[PDB]
C-alpha cells in the first residue's frame, strides 16, 4: 500500500508518503486537505491511535477532504487494510447478537429496505474487512469493521446506533 498526505488542497504543501499503519501522523503533517492513494485500501482516523472519525480511501486522487467524506482536514492516524479473499458478516436486530439475523457475503447499499427486519444493532464479522455507514448508499459517518465481534455500537466506535449501509473492502483496478 502507498498513500500520500498533503497539508493543502489540490495536492500542495507539506506532504508525507506512507506505506504502513501509523498510530500518530502528527510528526509528519498538521492537517490533511488532499490525498493521493497510489495503492491499497486505507482507513484514515481523525485522532491518534485510530480514534475519532474514520474514513475509507482507496486507489485514486482526492483533491479535497470532502472527497473522502471528511468532517474536517484532521487526519492523525491510519490503517492499511489487508486483503480479503472473501467477506461474510452476520447482522443482528438487537444488541449482543439477539433478534432476527441475516448472513451476507455481498454489499448492502440499503439495510432497511433489504431484509426481513428493520433494526440493526450488532454484527459478527466472520470473514474480511467491511465499512459500516451511518446512511444508505455509503454516506455519512464511517466505521471500519474488522474480523471479530461487535455487540453494540460502542464496539465499532459510534456515538449511537444509526446505521444505513455496509460495504466490503476490496481493492479497485
Residue 171 to residue 41: CA distance in whole angstroms: 6
- Residue in 130, 125, 112 with CA at minimum distance from that of residue 167: 130
- Residue 83: DSSP 8-state: P
Alpha carbons within 13 A on the beta-carbon side of 37: 24
- Residue 159: DSSP 8-state: S
Residue 112 to residue 104: CA distance in whole angstroms: 14
- Residue 138: DSSP 8-state: T
Interacting residues of 69 by C-beta distance below 8 A, sequence separation 6+:
55, 139, 140, 142
Q: Which domains does the chain have, with CATH numbers?
A: 1-83 (2.60.20.10), 84-173 (2.60.20.10)
- Residue 40: DSSP 8-state: S
- Resolution, Å (one decimal): 1.7
For residue 114, the SS3 value is helix
Is the CB of residue 164 less than 8 Å from the CB of residue 136? yes
* Cα of 48 vs its chain's centroid, Å: 15
Report the b/e string of 77-97 with b at 16+ CB within 10 A: bbbbbeebeebbbebbbebeb
Map grid coordinates 482507496 to a residue: 58
Interacting residues of 66 by C-beta distance below 8 A, sequence separation 6+:
none
- Residue in 61, 52, 86, 22 with CA at minimum distance from that of residue 157: 52
**Alpha-helix residue ranges (DSSP H) falling in the chain:** 111-114
Termini Cα distance of the chain: 14
Residue 112 to residue 50: CA distance in whole angstroms: 29
For residue 81 the three cell numbers come to: 487494510
For this PDB entry, the determination method is X-ray
Residue 36 to residue 10: CA distance in whole angstroms: 10
Is the CB of residue 127 less than 8 Å from the CB of residue 83? no
Amino acid at each position: 500500500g502507498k498513500i500520500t498526505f498533503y497539508e493543502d488542497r489540490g495536492f500542495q504543501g507539506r506532504h508525507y508518503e506512507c506505506s504502513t499503519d501509523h498510530s500518530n501522523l502528527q510528526p509528519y503533517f498538521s492537517r490533511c486537505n488532499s490525498v493521493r492513494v497510489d495503492s491499497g485500501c486505507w482507513m484514515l482516523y481523525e485522532q491518534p491511535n485510530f480514534t475519532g472519525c474514520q474514513y475509507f480511501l482507496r486507489r485514486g486522487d482526492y483533491p479535497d477532504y470532502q472527497q473522502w467524506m471528511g468532517f474536517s482536514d484532521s487526519v492523525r492516524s491510519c490503517r492499511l487494510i489487508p486483503h480479503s479473499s472473501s467477506h461474510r458478516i452476520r447482522i443482528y436486530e438487537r444488541e449482543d447478537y439477539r433478534g432476527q439475523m441475516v448472513e451476507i457475503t455481498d454489499d448492502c447499499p440499503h439495510l432497511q429496505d433489504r431484509f426481513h427486519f428493520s433494526d440493526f444493532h450488532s454484527f459478527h464479522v466472520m470473514e474480511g474487512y467491511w465499512v459500516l455507514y451511518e446512511m444508505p448508499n455509503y454516506r455519512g459517518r464511517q466505521y471500519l469493521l474488522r474480523p471479530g465481534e461487535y455487540r453494540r455500537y460502542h464496539d465499532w466506535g459510534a456515538m449511537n446506533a444509526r446505521v444505513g449501509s455496509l460495504r466490503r473492502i476490496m481493492d479497485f483496478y
